[PDB]
Amino acid sequence: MVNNINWVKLPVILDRLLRHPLLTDLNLETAIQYTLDFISAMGLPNVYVDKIETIDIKEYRGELPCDLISINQVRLHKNGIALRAMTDNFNAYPTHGEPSFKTQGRVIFTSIKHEKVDISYKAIMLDDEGLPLIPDNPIFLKTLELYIKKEWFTILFDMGKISPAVLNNTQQEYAFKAGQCNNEFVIPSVSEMEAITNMWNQLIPRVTEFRRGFKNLGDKEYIRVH
Amino acid sequence: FGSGAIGYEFDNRYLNNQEMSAVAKQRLTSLP
């Protein structure tokens, strides 16, 4: 992302929606739901807060933090070796190698019995109130406004209170701005393009940045002169 | 005699159907 994620409170979207006389019955209760829906449907990683938190494994199982939504990586606390997805179907079940993990709910199923693991996970930036906190990027705000507008007009059109042309125009505008926001939050910055360039041009390829925490994904690959 | 509690709503419904017919022909064109 070229731009920065300056955070603002949720009713900044209701500043903008309620200009429209047909969206005057929207509330913070509706804003919260549709904003979470938009955050998830877009799936932009720059909107989440990067956090690292260590837990202990009792026996191939560990308690997971409360605010976790996705896991960037899991590693062993003492070695630093990263973990992979567990393809095994019989992990903690005995009969009569390289470590791995799996996460479903509040439980993480590792292949280690008793060890501490570091989890780099993503969460949502919250407000002083326990509510989501949205970027103030006007592209993001306009796209979220159009999302909420499109949902409300879909309801009104199912009722027959909106002309079909109106809903078609709203959907068209929302689709274009959804593409625009997706590209805005995804296209690399200049500093990120240096990382991508250092990853791309490698006379001797580096294919083991997963073992580390992708620390050296972006380091330059310096060849000595002979 | 006189009472318009049934004729008024029927006239309003007729004009609502005309409203929906009029706005159902509205198109935002393409291919420019």
Side-chain angles (χ1 to χ4, degrees), chain A residues 53-58 61-65 106-108 119:
Chain A
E53 197 274 329
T54 297
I55 60 191
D56 56 355
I57 307 289
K58 293 179 179 179
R61 273 171 90 132
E63 191 67 25
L64 208 64
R106 284 273 320 263
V107 178
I108 184 171
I119 300 160

Side-chain angles (χ1 to χ4, degrees), chain B:
Chain B
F1 274 88
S3 171
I6 298 286
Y8 180 93
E9 69 183 5
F10 284 148
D11 293 333
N12 194 83
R13 201 158 150 65
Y14 181 89
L15 296 165
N16 293 359
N17 305 347
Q18 273 214 0
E19 182 86 330
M20 293 180 183
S21 66
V23 304
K25 285 141 55 162
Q26 297 175 349
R27 304 281 142 99
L28 294 174
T29 61
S30 171
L31 197 148

Side-chain angles (χ1 to χ4, degrees), chain A residues 9-21:
Chain A
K9 294 181 176 67
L10 194 54
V12 178
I13 201 73
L14 286 149
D15 280 358
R16 295 179 67 251
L17 282 169
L18 278 54
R19 274 171 200 290
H20 201 321

Side-chain angles (χ1 to χ4, degrees), chain A residues 205-223:
Chain A
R206 286 196 258 95
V207 292
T208 289
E209 320 95 328
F210 191 96
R211 167 186 334 274
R212 282 84 68 182
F214 284 103
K215 186 180 289 293
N216 315 119
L217 182 74
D219 298 305
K220 184 152 290 153
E221 171 265 339
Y222 296 103
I223 296 276

Side-chain angles (χ1 to χ4, degrees), chain A residues 16 38 42 138-147 170-185:
Chain A
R16 295 179 67 251
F38 179 69
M42 281 305 248
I139 289 168
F140 190 91
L141 292 175
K142 186 71 182 333
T143 306
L144 173 61
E145 188 207 310
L146 269 162
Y147 183 89
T170 308
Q171 292 171 336
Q172 206 198 40
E173 287 209 12
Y174 168 67
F176 186 80
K177 298 296 290 187
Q180 182 144 323
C181 182
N182 170 25
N183 277 353
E184 170 73 70
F185 278 68

